[PDB]
Each structure stands twice: as structure tokens, then as C-alpha cells.
């Protein structure tokens, strides 16, 4: 109430082909995975292998810049109008937000929370807190397994066969606990650090439990493309990146949230992800191959999201829209 509430875009409206196919699309927010040890990278170890094995439909991102090195940040900006470099926290708290637009322009909107918190940002969207469920399969000590989201996926396809967008906030690499990221099919880098005291434990076997949360992240991704890949009648998209990243013991710091001035490249520097179904590549207007070389030359940051979720929705009369910042645009049909 401080400053009078602006709504953006108040007459936005989906300009869609005549006669089109519904469009999905799965934005999944990560949590403290960073890019460094992310396998599509070049990482030594392949973290990401089933990523890697779907080759070239992965679009990977290997120069992307997150704008907070927190949750309370990372989120409100990035799905806020605003750039790091011009953040104001308290416009930001004051104005309508990228869910808020989409949702008036026709867009079924919906946020499933499985870390903690949306700061903010799903108020005004139906959202639901699936840690909640407590169910023994994924949850303990008031965390969940990321899996358990998939559980709730069918329910938002099938709730109508309007576009929508869904939103999958994951828990990640989330530590002190990291252990408790992932299961037995992940534990693949041994010995680990099964204690949330993870000062106690070495460096390197603090690494191979970090490392093992981002084999969990990539069959996360994984399943939710197979939730998918096989409607051949759904333009689908599904977007990952994560919302900063995580220092495991260099130079002394632990965890995040380091000022962002002084944050290391580890907290900095996150993964990015998409994957377009067959009917988004027949349908959606994208030159693919434009894309993969621009994925691969650019450097990106959280400052795209906004623009890039518009786009994917062909969201029009949108004063927000910044086509310079929309990822796909440079390869779209005009
Ligand atoms: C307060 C930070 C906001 C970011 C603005 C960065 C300058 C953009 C203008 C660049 N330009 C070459 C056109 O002058
Ligand atoms: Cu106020
Ligand atoms: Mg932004
Ligand atoms: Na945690
Ligand atoms: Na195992
Ligand atoms: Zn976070």
C-alpha cells in the first residue's frame, strides 16, 4: 500500500494461430544447482546423463547469470519486469508480475510448491504446497523428494484445454541436506555426507553428495518431458533454470546467499534447460538449429525469463515485452 499498485498490461490477449493446438508449458524453477558441475556443461562427471542421452532435442545453456544468490531475490526479480541492474524491490512488490499478465491475458496459471515458498510471486495464481502432503514415498523431516510433484502433474494437463503455464518449484540441490535430495538410483558418487553438519565431513565427499542432487534434477526433467513427449496433440514446452548457485567449501563459504557483489562464479553461474515437444517444433515458429548456436554463443541471465515466457504464451498488446530479451525471438518466424 507505500506506493499506489500498478497493473501492467491490462488489456493483454493470446494471439495464437487460428485454429491451434494447445500450448503447455512447464516452467520448472531449480533451487542452489549451479552450472559448474552440471554435465551438459562439460562437467568431469556426467550429472546429467539422461539429458545427454536425449542429445540434440536438449537445448543447454552454458552462459547463464542468475540475479540474486537467494531465493527471496533470484524469484521476485526474474519474474518481475525489472533487470538485475535496475531491481527496485519495492516497484517490483508493487506492480503486476509475469504470472499476474499471463494469467489476464487467458492463460490457466499454476504453481506447485515444493520449496519452501513462492515468495510472493504465485499469490495471485492457484498454487498449492505439495511438501504438505507429507507422504512417506518422497518426505521427511518437512522436505520432499522433487519426484512427489510429478504426482499432481495430470491433474493441471487435465484440468481444461486451455494454454497454460505450470510452474514446478523444486527443492533441488538444497542443502545442508543434501542427502536427502535424492535416492538410491542417483547415489551414484560415493562416499557422501549423510548429516546436514556439513563442515564435518570432507570436501570431497561433500562434493559427490552435491553432485548426486543434480543426477536427481536431471531425471526430474527427464520424467516431466516423458509426462510429455507422447501427446502428439500438445505443443509443449519445458523450461529449467535454476535460481542461483552454491559454494561447497572454496575459499571458505558455504551455501549461498553471498552479496551479489562479492559472490563467487558458483553462486552466479546456474544451468539452463529446454525441451520443445513435436507438435512446439512443427507448430511454434522456431528454427531450432538458430536456436542451439544462439544457446551456445550468447550469455544469459534471469533478466530473459519475463520476455521469454511472454513469448512462448504469443502474448499481444504486451507494453512488458522486451523482444531483445525473449530467447526465442531471434529464431522466430515472423
Ligand atoms: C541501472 C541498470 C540498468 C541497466 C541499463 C544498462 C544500459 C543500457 C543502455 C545501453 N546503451 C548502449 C543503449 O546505451
Ligand atoms: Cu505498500
Ligand atoms: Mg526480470
Ligand atoms: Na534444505
Ligand atoms: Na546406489
Ligand atoms: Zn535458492
Same mark, same amino acid.
Given at each position: 500500500?507505500?506506493?499506489?499498485?500498478?497493473?501492467?498490461?491490462? +488489456?493483454?490477449?493470446?494471439?495464437? !494461430?487460428?485454429?491451434?493446438?494447445?500450448?503447455?508449458?512447464?516452467?520448472?524453477?531449480?533451487?542452489?544447482?549451479? +552450472?559448474?558441475?552440471?554435465?551438459?556443461?562439460?562437467?568431469?562427471?556426467?550429472?546429467?546423463?539422461?539429458?545427454?542421452?536425449?542429445?540434440?532435442?536438449?537445448?543447454?545453456?552454458?552462459?547463464?547469470?542468475?540475479?540474486?544468490?537467494?531465493?527471496?531475490?533470484?524469484? !521476485?526479480?526474474?519474474?518481475?519486469?525489472? /533487470?538485475?541492474? /535496475?531491481?527496485?524491490?519495492?516497484?517490483?512488490?508493487?506492480?503486476?508480475?509475469?504470472?499476474?499478465?499471463?494469467?489476464?491475458?487467458? @492463460?490457466?496459471?499454476?504453481?506447485?510448491?515444493?520449496?519452501?515458498?513462492?515468495?510472493?510471486?504465485?499469490?495471485?495464481?492457484?498454487?498449492?504446497?505439495?511438501?504438505?502432503?507429507?507422504?512417506?514415498?518422497?518426505?521427511?523431516?518437512?522436505?520432499?523428494?522433487?519426484?512427489?510433484?510429478?504426482?499432481?502433474?495430470?491433474?493441471?494437463?487435465?484440468?481444461?484445454?486451455?494454454?497454460?503455464?505450470?510452474?514446478?518449484?523444486?527443492?533441488?540441490?538444497?542443502?545442508?541436506?543434501?542427502?536427502?535430495?535424492?535416492?538410491?538410483?542417483?547415489?551414484?558418487?560415493?562416499?557422501?555426507?549423510?548429516?546436514?553438519?556439513?563442515?564435518?565431513?570432507?570436501?570431497?565427499?561433500?562434493?559427490?553428495?552435491?553432485?548426486?542432487?543434480?543426477?536427481?534434477?536431471?531425471?526430474?526433467?527427464?520424467?516431466?518431458?516423458?509426462?510429455?513427449?507422447?501427446?502428439?496433440?500438445?505443443?509443449?514446452?519445458?523450461?529449467?533454470?535454476?535460481?542461483?548457485?552454491?559454494?561447497?567449501?572454496?575459499?571458505?563459504?558455504?551455501?549461498?546467499?553471498? !552479496?551479489?557483489?562479492?559472490?563467487?562464479?558458483?553462486?552466479?553461474?546456474?544451468?539452463? @534447460?529446454?525441451?520443445?515437444?513435436?507438435?512446439?517444433?512443427?507448430?511454434?515458429?522456431?528454427?531450432?538449429?538458430?536456436?542451439?548456436?544462439?544457446?551456445?554463443?550468447?550469455?544469459?541471465?534471469?533478466?530473459?525469463?519475463?520476455?521469454?515466457?511472454?513469448?512462448?504464451?504469443?502474448?499481444?498488446?504486451?507494453?512488458?515485452?522486451?523482444?531483445?530479451?525473449?530467447?526465442?525471438?531471434?529464431?522466430?518466424? !515472423?
Amino acid at each position: 500500500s507505500n506506493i499506489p499498485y500498478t497493473q501492467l498490461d491490462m +488489456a493483454v490477449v493470446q494471439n495464437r !494461430p487460428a485454429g491451434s493446438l494447445r500450448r503447455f508449458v512447464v516452467l520448472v524453477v531449480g533451487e542452489t544447482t549451479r +552450472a559448474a558441475n552440471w554435465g551438459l556443461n562439460g562437467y568431469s562427471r556426467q550429472t546429467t546423463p539422461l539429458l545427454a542421452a536425449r542429445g540434440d532435442e536438449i537445448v543447454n545453456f552454458p552462459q547463464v547469470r542468475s540475479c540474486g544468490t537467494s531465493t527471496a531475490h533470484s524469484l !521476485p526479480c526474474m519474474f518481475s519486469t525489472f /533487470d538485475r541492474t /535496475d531491481y527496485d524491490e519495492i516497484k517490483a512488490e508493487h506492480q503486476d508480475n509475469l504470472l499476474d499478465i499471463v494469467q489476464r491475458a487467458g @492463460v490457466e496459471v499454476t504453481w506447485l510448491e515444493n520449496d519452501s515458498g513462492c515468495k510472493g510471486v504465485c499469490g495471485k495464481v492457484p498454487n498449492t504446497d505439495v511438501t504438505s502432503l507429507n507422504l512417506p514415498e518422497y518426505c521427511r523431516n518437512g522436505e520432499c523428494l522433487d519426484n512427489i510433484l510429478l504426482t499432481k502433474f495430470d491433474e493441471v494437463l487435465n484440468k481444461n484445454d486451455k494454454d497454460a503455464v505450470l510452474i514446478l518449484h523444486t527443492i533441488g540441490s538444497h542443502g545442508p541436506t543434501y542427502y536427502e535430495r535424492y535416492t538410491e538410483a542417483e547415489r551414484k558418487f560415493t562416499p557422501t555426507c549423510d548429516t546436514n553438519e556439513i563442515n564435518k565431513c570432507t570436501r570431497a565427499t561433500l562434493v559427490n553428495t552435491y553432485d548426486n542432487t543434480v543426477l536427481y534434477v536431471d531425471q526430474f526433467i527427464d520424467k516431466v518431458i516423458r509426462k510429455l513427449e507422447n501427446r502428439d496433440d500438445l505443443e509443449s514446452v519445458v523450461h529449467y533454470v535454476s535460481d542461483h548457485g552454491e559454494s561447497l567449501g572454496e575459499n571458505g563459504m558455504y551455501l549461498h546467499a553471498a !552479496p551479489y557483489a562479492i559472490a563467487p562464479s558458483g553462486q552466479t553461474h546456474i544451468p539452463m @534447460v529446454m525441451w520443445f515437444s513435436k507438435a512446439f517444433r512443427q507448430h511454434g515458429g522456431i528454427d531450432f538449429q538458430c536456436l542451439k548456436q544462439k544457446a551456445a554463443e550468447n550469455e544469459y541471465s534471469h533478466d530473459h525469463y519475463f520476455s521469454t515466457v511472454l513469448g512462448l504464451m504469443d502474448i499481444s498488446n504486451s507494453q512488458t515485452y522486451r523482444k531483445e530479451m525473449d530467447i526465442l525471438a531471434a529464431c522466430r518466424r !515472423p
